[PDB]
C-alpha cells in the first residue's frame, strides 16, 4: 500500500460527521463549513456504552438477594458501595439526585475511556471496508462535545442548586460581597466569582478531553510511525499507563462533580 503517515494521522483525527439538514455523509478530504453536521462516531459509541451500563445494572438489580452473593453481583455491589461511600464522604444533604448522578458519571466516563485501549485501526477498518463509512473514531471521550455537554449539564445543576438550596439571595450576597465583603470590591467580587464559577466546569470538561485526546493521538502516532516489529515495545508500556489514566480520570470527574455540587448546595 502507498500512504503518507501524515495522511494516515489525518484520517484518524476526522469524524463521520453527517449533515442534519440534507442527511449527507461528510468526507475527511473536504470539510464543509456548516454548523449542523453531528459528529456521529463519538456519539454512536457513547450511547451504546450507556445502554450497556443500564442493561448490566438492571440485569443485576432485577435479581440481587441478601443471601449468598454471587460472583457477578459482587462487582456491582462493590461499585455501588464505592460511589455511595464517596457521596456520603462529600455530601450530607437529602437530595436523591446526587448519588445516581455521580454513579452514572463514573460508570459512563469509565466506559467511554476504555474504548481507547482497543486497537486503533480495528473498528475503523471494519467500518470503512465492511460497511463503507468514510470515517470513524471510536473513543467517545476524545470528543470535546461529549466532555463539554457533560460539564455544562453539571454547571446547570450547580446553578439550580445555588438558586434553590443555597438561595438566589444567598447567591447575590456571595457574588457581591465575597470574598472582600466591601462595596469598593463588589464590582471586583462579581468578576472574580464569575470567572471561578465558569472556570470550574470548563476545567472538568477540558481536563477529560485533554487526557483522552492526548492518549488517542499517542496511540495513533505509535501505530503510524513505527514499523510493525518495533511498535509493541512502545505501545505496551503506554496502554498499561493509560489504564491507570482512565481510572484516575473517571474518579476525578466523579469526585470533582460531587465536590462542586456539595459546595454549591451547602
Amino acid at each position: 500500500e502507498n500512504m503518507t503517515p501524515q495522511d494516515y494521522i489525518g484520517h484518524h483525527l476526522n469524524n463521520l460527521q453527517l449533515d442534519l439538514r440534507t442527511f449527507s455523509l461528510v468526507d475527511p478530504q473536504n470539510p464543509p463549513a456548516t454548523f449542523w453536521t453531528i459528529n456521529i462516531d463519538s456519539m454512536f459509541f457513547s450511547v451504546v456504552l450507556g445502554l450497556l451500563f443500564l442493561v448490566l445494572f438492571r440485569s443485576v438489580a432485577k435479581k440481587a438477594t441478601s443471601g449468598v452473593p454471587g460472583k457477578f453481583q459482587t462487582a456491582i455491589e462493590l461499585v455501588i458501595g464505592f460511589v455511595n461511600g464517596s457521596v456520603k464522604d462529600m455530601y450530607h444533604g437529602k437530595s436523591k439526585l446526587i448519588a445516581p448522578l455521580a454513579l452514572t458519571i463514573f460508570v459512563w466516563v469509565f466506559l467511554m475511556n476504555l474504548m481507547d485501549l482497543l486497537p486503533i485501526d480495528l473498528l475503523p477498518y471494519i467500518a470503512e471496508h465492511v460497511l463503507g463509512l468514510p470515517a470513524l473514531r471510536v473513543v467517545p471521550s476524545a470528543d470535546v462535545n461529549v466532555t463539554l455537554s457533560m460539564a455544562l449539564g453539571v454547571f446547570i445543576l450547580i446553578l439550580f442548586y445555588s438558586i434553590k438550596m443555597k438561595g438566589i439571595g444567598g447567591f447575590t450576597k456571595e457574588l457581591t460581597l465575597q470574598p472582600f465583603n466591601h462595596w469598593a470590591f463588589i464590582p471586583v467580587n462579581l468578576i472574580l466569582e464569575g470567572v471561578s464559577l465558569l472556570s470550574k466546569p470548563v476545567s472538568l470538561g477540558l481536563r477529560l478531553f485533554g487526557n483522552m485526546y492526548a492518549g488517542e493521538l499517542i496511540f495513533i502516532l505509535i501505530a503510524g510511525l513505527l514499523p510493525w516489529w518495533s511498535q509493541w515495545i512502545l505501545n505496551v508500556p503506554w496502554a498499561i499507563f493509560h489504564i491507570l489514566i482512565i481510572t484516575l480520570q473517571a474518579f476525578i470527574f466523579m469526585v470533582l462533580t460531587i465536590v462542586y455540587l456539595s459546595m454549591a448546595s451547602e
Binding site: 470574598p179 468578576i191 472574580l192 466569582e193 470567572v195 471561578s196 472556570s199 465536590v259 459546595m263
Partner: protein, 77 residues
C-alpha cells in the same frame, strides 16, 4: 499572511506563561494542604474548603489570561 500568523505565537506565549504560573502556584498550595491534612487527619474537610477558597483566588488571573489568549487565537484568529 504574517499579520494573523504571528497572533498565534502571541496567544501561545500568553497562555503558556499563564499555565506555568497557575500550575506552580496551585502545586505549592496543594502541597501545603496535603501536609496540613497529614498533620491533622480529622481536619481534612475544613482545610479542603479553605484550599478551594484560596484556589478560586489563585486561578482567576491565569484563567482570564488563558481566556483572552483563546479569544486572540479564535475570534481574532
Amino acid at each position: 499572511n504574517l499579520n494573523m500568523d504571528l497572533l498565534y505565537m502571541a496567544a501561545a506565549v500568553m497562555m503558556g506563561l499563564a499555565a506555568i504560573g497557575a500550575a506552580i502556584g496551585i502545586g505549592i498550595l496543594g502541597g501545603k494542604f496535603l501536609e496540613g491534612a497529614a498533620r491533622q487527619p480529622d481536619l481534612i474537610p475544613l482545610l479542603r474548603t479553605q484550599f478551594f477558597i484560596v484556589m478560586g483566588l489563585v486561578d482567576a488571573i491565569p484563567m482570564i489570561a488563558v481566556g483572552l489568549g483563546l479569544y486572540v487565537m479564535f475570534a481574532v484568529a
